[PDB]
Design a binder for this molecule. Structure first.
Ligand code: LV4
Length: 435
């Protein structure tokens, strides 16, 4: 694995021990060979579980998720996928790692795709080695891979709305269920229905994941209602998965706006990771996977791959060269390498709109490429009437930084800034000049 110009896909089945058994063996070998190594965790939750699996090995935890005192001698760094891509984009020296390990390397967030593109390009150049750890590499067609114990797979109608009858199997269960929903708002409705039926429910999404995930350990629960974020190495002591088999697809229309299309079918990889939450205990056969639709390759034309190209166009590689997407996922976008390359000041703006602005990549790019500076929020108000953002069926309103009440009507409409109450709250604070 560890020889330069090698990229290895460690594709053992979910629960095969890639993170807790294989990764420490790789890390020990890497330290023996004096390879400057980076380990990329998808989430802070996985970063913390990695510290336990790697404990005693000299690893620098580049995350506040781990409360350790680093010796200063470590040649192995551990950080989140997003932190890697963030540091590449910022005016900060990222070491030229000899070995690049990405855990949960199926993660389809733009920063994860960009990180794979950067790493795979360095390997192709002959500069580095890489290991991508995932049961479900890009283009996998197998939604039902092997497991530690037999799974009961059942195709069944799964509710996506509150229900009164017809789904007794949902509530008759006496164990613990992880339920994959296509959105936060959809999970809110299902969670309310279960809570009304006397169930204890925890809800997980990207913005709440670290905090809320700890509830799965610290309190008794009957259901976890989760978006696709729990595909990224989230482990539950569960005996059933209910999978809508649906997700939202961000789609750029006419190069002009982003909509959240669907819900529509998940990929085979997503379905295999959702299922893969259970069947993990070789002493507990007959965990259940109930699935409510088929799979499709909904990553094709999905905005995250175009957003990854905007990130990679703005990362220095060598002179004017630009990193390519990782070959197996490179056809998922119709993009021209370099088309999103920004001049110095516009690039800095782009980075800050993502890092401090917390705006989606596509929206950050529209603003920066228009020659708008980070603190200039006029664009949040001067869009067409059809870009009016609604709050409970009325136009959303903010007080501008000037103290004027205005309708939120962004010049560029990206549905992710108002996908749920928390998103819209964050975007209101942005339009108001509060960050
Ligand atoms: N525990 C430490 S001293 N970690 C660390 C070391 C070097 C860079 C970043 C780091 O993360 C931090 F900033 F959260 F501490």
């Amino acid at each position: 694995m560890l020889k330069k110009k090698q990229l290895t896909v460690l594709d053992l089945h979910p629960g095969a021990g890639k993170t807790r058994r294989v990764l420490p063996e790789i890390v020990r070998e890497a330290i023996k060979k004096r390879l400057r190594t980076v380990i990329l965790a998808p989430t802070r939750v996985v970063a913390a579980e990695m510290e336990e699996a790697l404990r005693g090995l000299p690893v620098r935890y580049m995350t506040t998720a781990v409360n350790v005192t680093h010796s200063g001698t470590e040649i192995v760094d551990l950080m989140c996928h997003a932190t890697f891509t963030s540091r590449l984009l910022q005016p900060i020296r990222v070491p030229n790692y000899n070995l690049n390990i990405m855990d949960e390397a199926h993660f389809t967030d733009p920063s994860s795709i960009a990180a794979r593109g950067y790493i795979s390009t360095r390997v192709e150049m002959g500069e580095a080695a890489a290991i991508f750890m995932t049961a479900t590499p890009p283009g996998t067609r197998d939604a039902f891979p092997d497991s530690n114990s037999p799974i009961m797979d059942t195709e069944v109608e799964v509710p996506e709305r509150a229900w009164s009858s017809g789904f007794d199997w949902v509530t008759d269960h006496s164990g613990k269920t992880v339920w994959f929903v296509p959105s936060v708002r959809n999970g809110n409705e299902i969670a309310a229905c279960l809570t009304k039926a006397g169930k204890r429910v925890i809800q997980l999404s990207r913005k709440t994941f670290e905090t809320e995930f700890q509830k799965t350990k610290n309190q008794e629960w009957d259901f976890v209602i989760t978006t696709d974020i729990s595909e990224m190495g989230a482990n539950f002591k569960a005996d059933r998965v209910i999978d809508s088999r649906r997700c939202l697809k961000p789609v750029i229309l006419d190069g002009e706006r982003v909509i959240l299309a669907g819900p529509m079918p998940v990929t085979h990889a997503s379905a295999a990771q959702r299922r893969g939450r259970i069947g993990r205990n070789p002493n507990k056969p007959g965990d259940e996977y109930m699935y409510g639709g088929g799979c499709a390759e909904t990553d094709e034309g999905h905005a995250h791959w175009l957003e990854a190209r905007m990130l990679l166009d703005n990362i220095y590689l060598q002179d004017g060269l630009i990193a390519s997407l990782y070959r197996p996922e490179a056809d998922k976008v119709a993009a021209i390498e370099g088309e999103f390359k920004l001049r110095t000041e516009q690039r800095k703006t782009f980075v800050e709109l993502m890092k401090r602005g917390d705006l989606p990549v596509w929206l950050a790019y529209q603003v920066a490429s228009a020659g708008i500076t980070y603190t200039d929020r006029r664009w949040c108000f001067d869009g067409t009437t059809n870009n009016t953002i609604m709050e409970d069926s009325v136009p959303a309103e903010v007080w501008t930084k000037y103290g004027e009440k205005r309708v939120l009507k962004p010049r560029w409409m990206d549905a992710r800034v108002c996908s749920d109450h928390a998103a819209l709250k964050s975007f209101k604070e942005f339009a108001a000049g509060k960050r």
